[PDB]
Ligand binder design. Structure first.
Ligand SMILES: Nc1nccc(-c2c(-c3ccc(F)cc3)ncn2C2CCNCC2)n1
Ligand SMILES: N[C@]1(CO)[C@H]2C[C@@H]3C[C@@H](C[C@H]1C3)C2
Ligand SMILES: [Ca+2]
Ligand SMILES: [Ca+2]
Ligand SMILES: [Ca+2]
Ligand SMILES: [Ca+2]
Ligand SMILES: [Cl-]
Length: 345
């Protein structure tokens, strides 16, 4: 049995194995808060997320199970995955706390662009990694739906991982129009719109669509991409929303070459393929990885897809204690990955 110790962090007691030392808070995550730590078994730096009240309600209990199942499945260099999962509980009857462990990533994408004029080669690398991660999660029928710079973890060498996928006032500036406006259908390319918004901001240093509300953001979007056709209205349930959009003065699409002056023309071309209102005509992650903009990084042998992911639990309503027992089962069955899982190409 590992010896646990207790430490008050973020005004609450954490109980963690002696293996993990020097815990220091590094912010909140989805449904929990996060500490950096030193893993004395491997000498590696890790991030430990303590889930907040994981079994307080049917909502918390199912999302705890969902997050653990998702993170146990994610095995990709550009997607947050699990090094460890632990609980101080000695049995299911005591089980009330869940801690998730991953590699430490010191920053988010906002730390990278804030005080640094990025080079085009560096922008290519950052966006390439997002797209590689999205190809992987999308291949498992997992969509992020709220991709944005604060959901991209980055380390000291600009290596990037997507987090908080497949799951307080949030920024909406990177959300796909079909998501922000609650349209009746969408596909995995909601995340590609978000990539376009992020990439645009990495190239210009300015937020692409900094709208003050739903309607102001939509107006900024339409100024760039032009007024949509009537076929777009098909997707919008609310008559007042449809009537509003229809009543707008028509706007032509802008030439993105006039918006992103001085950018690599290949970057402009990629943006034109991402920032399209018609989600059926938006480029996919796998298609974008083949785009000439990423030629110096693209490597088809190193852009893998995911193993099939069984999401049948999503349609089921179970009792709190059933989700709790399922979660306990997933904690106990977890197999830590090898420290070194990669080989020279
Ligand atoms: N510093 C760092 N490094 C890696 C991940 C995180 C992390 C996690 C997280 C997820 C799963 C897990 F098992 C462990 C941690 N959730 C949110 N964040 C950060 C995301 C950027 N803002 C601060 C919190 N933070
Ligand atoms: N952000 C910008 C330029 O500042 C605004 C004006 C126009 C349309 C959108 C996207 C670009 C170009 C909003
Ligand atoms: Ca390679
Ligand atoms: Ca190796
Ligand atoms: Ca490495
Ligand atoms: Ca090869
Ligand atoms: Cl599975």
């Amino acid at each position: 049995r590992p010896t646990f110790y207790r430490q008050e962090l973020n005004k609450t007691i954490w109980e963690v194995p002696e293996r993990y030392q020097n815990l220091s808070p590094v912010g909140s995550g989805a449904y929990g808060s996060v500490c950096a730590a030193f893993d004395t078994k491997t000498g590696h730096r890790v991030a430990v997320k303590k889930l907040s009240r994981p079994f307080q309600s049917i909502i918390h209990a199912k999302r705890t199970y969902r997050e653990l199942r998702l993170l146990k499945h994610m095995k990709h260099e550009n997607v947050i995955g699990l090094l460890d999962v632990f609980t101080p509980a000695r049995s299911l009857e005591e089980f009330n706390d869940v801690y998730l462990v991953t590699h430490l990533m010191g920053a988010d994408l906002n730390n990278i662009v804030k005080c640094q004029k990025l080079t085009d080669d560096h922008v290519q690398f950052l966006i390439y990694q997002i797209l590689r991660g999205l190809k992987y999660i999308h291949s498992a029928d997992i969509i992020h739906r709220d991709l944005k710079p604060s959901n991209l973890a980055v380390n000291e060498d600009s290596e990037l991982k997507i987090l908080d996928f497949g799951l307080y006032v949030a920024t909406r500036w990177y959300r796909a129009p079909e998501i922000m406006l609650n349209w009746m259908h969408y596909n995995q390319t909601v995340d590609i719109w978000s990539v376009g918004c992020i990439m645009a901001e990495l190239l210009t240093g300015r937020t692409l669509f900094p709208g003050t509300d739903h309607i102001d953001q939509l107006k900024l979007i339409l100024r760039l991409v032009g007024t949509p056709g009537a076929e777009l209205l098909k997707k919008i349930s609310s008559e007042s929303a449809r009537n509003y959009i229809q009543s707008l003065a028509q706007m032509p699409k802008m030439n993105f070459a006039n918006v992103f002056i001085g950018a690599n023309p290949l970057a402009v071309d990629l943006l034109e393929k991402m920032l399209v209102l018609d989600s059926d005509k938006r480029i996919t992650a796998a298609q974008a990885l083949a785009h000439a903009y990423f030629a110096q990084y693209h490597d088809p042998d190193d852009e893998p897809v995911a193993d099939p992911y069984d999401q049948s639990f999503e349609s089921r309503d179970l009792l709190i204690d059933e989700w709790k027992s399922l979660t306990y089962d997933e904690v106990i069955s977890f197999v830590p990955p090898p420290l070194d899982q990669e080989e020279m190409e």
